[PDB]
């Protein structure tokens, strides 16, 4: 019942910001641009130093013309409107946002520990207690997001950053959407798509719980439950309704994953009468103190190396691209609310 009351106040705070979003809270020359931390189809994320405070931030830069060509206008508006309104310990904080003639900018907290992706690939796989620690944070985050009628739709290790306390920060809200009914957009990452997305059905927040199953599997096995050289081959595996588990998976882990990687929506955990509690009370989580996880009181399985402020040694190197801003405003009407 206290979770219920906690979520009620969270929704009151969210809706205030959802209905009156922050806008134009900094400008580009408030920052020095240091180094690219990551890229994507839209767009790139740069380490920046805020001149007036000396704080470092991670600045996502989107080219408005590219956003238009990729038909991501509404998604980009979703991303910023949602990110500026949410507030949860495991969600990266949006500190500033603004736009200029050419680009959109979202300035987020810099999370120096690197992507979970990097650590997972290097180490091979996480122990089940390690994976469970991370998984518990995603469970709580989706409980929070779903209570706000938000679907996240892009869970993967690439989007989970490890902070200096060893806890997760979720990044990349590019496909997040506030929706009370079903929705239909084919989006996500191939390995993580639920069957109902691939099959062009209307779908709902249950796709995030499927994606959680993929994430737990990949953390504990070191590889995804459905992988191939091409996405079409991955989709055929996803919709087949068959999953194979490594022999070192515990019985409890396999049982949890069978209920998350469940094609049948009337049986998939997270989606049933008991909601998230079917997950929180599962035997695999028996050792998890959910309040202590939320409070960040649990000892983390590992603390990323910290070589100082502004150091990026936990991130890959990327080819550096200039930030060109045209003398003419592009796509002004499309992004007027950004």
């Amino acid at each position: 019942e206290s979770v219920k009351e906690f979520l009620a106040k969270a929704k009151e705070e969210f809706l205030k910001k959802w209905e009156s979003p922050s806008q134009n809270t900094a400008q580009l020359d408030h920052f020095d641009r240091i180094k690219t931390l990551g890229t994507g189809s839209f767009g790139r994320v740069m380490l920046v130093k805020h001149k007036e405070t000396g704080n470092h931030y991670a600045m996502k830069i989107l080219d408005k013309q590219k956003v238009v060509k990729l038909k991501q206008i509404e998604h980009t508006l979703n991303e910023k409107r949602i990110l500026q309104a949410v507030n949860f310990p495991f969600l990266v904080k949006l500190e500033f946002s603004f736009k200029d003639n050419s680009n959109l900018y979202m300035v987020m907290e810099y999370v120096p520990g690197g992507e979970m992706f990097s650590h997972l690939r290097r180490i091979g796989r996480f122990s089940e207690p390690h994976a469970r620690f991370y998984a518990a944070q995603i469970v709580l985050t989706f409980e929070y997001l779903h209570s706000l009628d938000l679907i996240y739709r892009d869970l993967k290790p690439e989007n989970l950053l490890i902070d200096q306390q060893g806890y997760i920060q979720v990044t990349d809200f590019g496909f997040a959407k506030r929706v009370k009914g079903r929705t239909w957009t084919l989006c996500g990452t191939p390995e993580y798509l639920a069957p109902e997305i691939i099959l062009s059905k209307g779908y709902n927040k249950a796709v995030d719980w499927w994606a959680l199953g993929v994430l737990i599997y990949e953390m504990a096995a070191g590889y995804p439950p459905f992988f191939a050289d091409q996405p079409i081959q991955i989709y055929e595996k996803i919709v087949s309704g068959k999953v194979r588990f490594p022999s070192h998976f515990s019985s409890d882990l396999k049982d949890l994953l069978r209920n998350l990687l469940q094609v049948d929506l009337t049986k998939r955990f997270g989606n049933l009468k008991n909601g998230v509690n079917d997950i929180k009370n599962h035997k695999w989580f028996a050792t998890t103190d959910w309040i202590a996880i939320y409070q960040r009181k649990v000892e983390a399985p590992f603390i990323p190396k910290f070589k100082g402020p502004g150091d990026t040694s936990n991130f890959d190197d990327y080819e550096e691209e200039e930030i060109r801003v045209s003398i003419n405003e592009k796509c002004g009407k499309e992004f007027t609310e950004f």
């Binding site: 189809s41 991501q72 892009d154 084919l186 989006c187 996500g188 191939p190 390995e191 992988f227 194979r244």
Partner: peptide
């Protein structure tokens, strides 16, 4: 092994979202 198959595959790097 399944691990060896994954490691030899073309999708062990960062995965892009579908658009």
């Amino acid at each position: 092994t399944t691990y060896a198959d994954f490691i030899a595959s073309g999708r062990t790097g960062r995965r892009n979202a579908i658009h």
